[model samples]
Target chain A: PTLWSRVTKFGSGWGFWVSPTVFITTTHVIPTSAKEFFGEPLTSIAIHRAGEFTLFRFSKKIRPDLTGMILEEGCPEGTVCSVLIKRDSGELLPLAVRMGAIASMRIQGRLVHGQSGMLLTGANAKGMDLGTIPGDCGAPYVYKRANDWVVCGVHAAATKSGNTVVCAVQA
Target chain B: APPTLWSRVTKFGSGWGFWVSPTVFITTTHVIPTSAKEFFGEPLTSIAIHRAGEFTLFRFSKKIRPDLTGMILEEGCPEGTVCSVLIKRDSGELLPLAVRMGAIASMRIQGRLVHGQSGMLLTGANAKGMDLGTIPGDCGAPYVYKRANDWVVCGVHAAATKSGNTVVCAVQ
Candidate 1:
């Protein structure tokens, strides 16, 4: 399975596996009443309000054949990245990968020193990619390192200025 | 000298459109009024919809020739392809905004499917090397890609996502 295979639909948003039974997504996508993961019941839900990420533990292990994504720390400015876009069909089928670049490591003037957030800008000279939409809130922003593909940030919001689309990512 | 391909595009009502035939103009359906009968001081003879209602053709009484030529429509480009976004600037000059292409993805706002079909995704870069975002007047613009030596129309500008980051175009 490819790196995008680790991505799954959670509620109306998206999530990705980090272990056999554990997945990570945005905190805002957590359902107010449901306790399920694509029909599979959840064993636990850990919401980090400040971090804007939520960890989900499922009762049964998922796709153990595939390795989960590893979280990495550093995403310097100009680092090339890719994000998976969910199709309108809302299936976990083969999806498109939108290319982008780490545009900033600081917001306003404060440096982004921790696993909080970073700004991602589309590097494509032609147009914008699968931007930060409602259901894309929990989509992963990944990049290659040496021989491994790692998760650098989680998509949170998108801001457009003039003709540019800048995404706010949860690191 | 022949007129540049970008010169075929003209301002239509509040949006932008281009000449497809000597007397026919093409634009996104949302940009034109429901009962539009005239454009650019010419009376519209007929109106036709295409591409599942995403695009419409307005035929005018006068032919646009000698000064302007129509554009050729081609098949839509695949993902990862680079295309040119034709936008009319506020100063009335046309600019071909370069954009990297993504798949035909659906757009949702607040979880509601705003544009569900035939939307070609792309991210653009401006001349200053920043992300290229579209303005309101850019709607109904045309997107073209190079074919051989000539440029052919491939898509029409539609709505932008709420974030204003992604500009969805109705592809051929």
Candidate 2:
């Protein structure tokens, strides 16, 4: 019901470079003639969580419908995730909505170079691939800790200078 | 990464974006996201500016966000992590968090579903709407809320890849 979204790390294809707040075109990735970035400079990022930011490319004026996350300290493992939509409680003007996280691929490995790319899997993660190219670094990676599906880390950077092109995990 | 109904930003050209760190967040003293932006005297949207003393405020330049155009507090900080601030100047003891974006309706929150996993009534706050954002890559904690006695995982403030505006959760 509310406008919601965010981004993790993605591949800039060497055409992008990380700018102050967003990304820019690097000689390695794009036509660097204009010193531009792949993202619209006018785009604004909204911090969804502490380490997460959503880049909005819309230019239309909108009255955003808001929602929130309610965490329960008692959720057990193997639970069915559902999206909860809240209606106006007669006290507020907007309707509140909530989404549930389904427990999907549970990896037992440590950050093996933090190479874990888009974690969507097991029917839950549908459109993500760990094979993110450059600029994919600093992308947000999420996983369920105990009871919450908090964003854990950014796809900081990729290591390509190694004798073997590999991802170097840095916490 | 959200396959169900994931929304994202496109430079429409740049693909590269710009933003002010929380340090430039409009409401430094209040919990953002909750604050509503009254545009044209109408509740058009919610707005917030990153505050100081917040580690999440760092930008690529390591300097305060320049793209974030707004008032850079002259030099007065109440302290670090002061929630629920009230301005004695006005009878408004509880002003909602007010964030300022370049334009209205362009900003939103990025919250995830963490509570319904366990079950709760306010699941609306879980992952459905107005999501503020959750932490990434961890065994536990999509840092929900950091209230007086609430437990907070790191990056709970801006934890999601998809983004949304912060709410003024705490009351002044």
Candidate 3:
């Protein structure tokens, strides 16, 4: 039920616990070439062909920063969204977005960017509405669905169409 | 070994595609290169896009720019992302068309496969005002928006719903 975890090693990114020992992320976020990632020089990064999702295991049982969260699918329109990131000053920025559309989702396709996931329109909105940027690729797009804050997708790219695309993590 | 030309030709424009500016547009390269072959082995000598009313005849202008724009794209859209389009009228006017965006909606319109690309935008949701946002003859137009005096091409009109109130388009 961990919502967001600061991945502060190879890059200042964020992730959520898929399992007590496993974490999921975007492959573009944590490149597969890296032998080690995150603070304390973590070990190994495994890439899942589907969704370009990365699975990383820590040396010890890792507890994420978030006290609680939920994971679900098929977000409706106007779902308020959020993600956590580590700024250059090494501070946590809790970015939130709202009045957004659930957009399109590629459940299956051969293209690298055509993996199954959700797209959020209006990255061009004012204020912290976009709340995603470089080094925050693996951050979770958490929305309150099914009466709990669940991880819907992972921040992958900022779109030219004035929107943001996420790498969907299957529940 | 080898594949038949018809098999390859038939698969063209199987997905959604869109235009950016008035002078240019985009669609999946998967679609047949020429509009003449867009239908089921039928040769469409000329093409025109209709919006609210009237049609602006368009001919293949010959490739004027590079196909690759060199921008990174992400996974496709989810569901309910509203997509908007602009169509040119014969009266020299452009009409705006809006539709809800989604995948797994419908791929055909009025009995033929519209050949959609990735991130197909959907319209005609009875939830609220979604139905009133679209109409007939809005296909092949650009789903565009204004970003500081500049129109950013987001998607393109492709197919329609069963009752004909909603439409589907392809995103950029």
Best by TM-score: 1
Candidate 2 TM-score, true structure as reference = 0.19
Query: Fraction of true contacts kept, per model?
Result: 0.00, 0.09, 0.00
Whole-model lDDT, model 2 = 0.23
Span of ten consecutive residues with least summed lDDT in model 1 chain B:
B123-132
lDDT tens string, model 1, A34-87? Answer: 766555754554444434556666666666776656775436655545555454
Ordered from best to worst lDDT, the candidate numbers read 1, 3, 2
> What is candidate 2's lDDT per residue for A1-91, written digit by digit as tens?
3111222122332111112233211112223244223343433433122212222222332223322233232223333222111111111
Q: Write the per-residue lDDT of candidate 2 for residues B61-143, one digit (tens) a residue.
A: 23333333332222211222222111111111111111111111122334432211111121122332233221221111111
lDDT for position B61 in model 3: 35
List, for all models, the DockQ compared with the true complex.
0.02, 0.04, 0.01
Question: CAPRI verdict on model 1?
Answer: incorrect
Chain A TM-scores, per candidate, are 0.64, 0.27, 0.58
Where's the lowest-lDDT run of ten residues in candidate 3 chain A? A114-123
What is the i-RMS of every prediction? 14.3, 15.8, 17.5
Per-residue C-alpha lDDT of model 1 across residues B118-160, encoded as one tens digit per residue: 3323322111111234666787888776645566777678766
Query: Between 1 and 3, whose lDDT is larger?
Result: 1
Please give the interface root mean square deviation for model 1, in Å. Answer: 14.3
Residue A95 of model 1, lDDT score: 16
Question: On a 0 to 100 scale, what is the lDDT of residue B31 in model 1?
Answer: 73
Candidate 2 residue runs with Cα over 4 Å from true position: A1-112, A115-138, A142-151, A155-171, B1-172
In model 2, the Cα lDDT at residue B53 comes to: 29
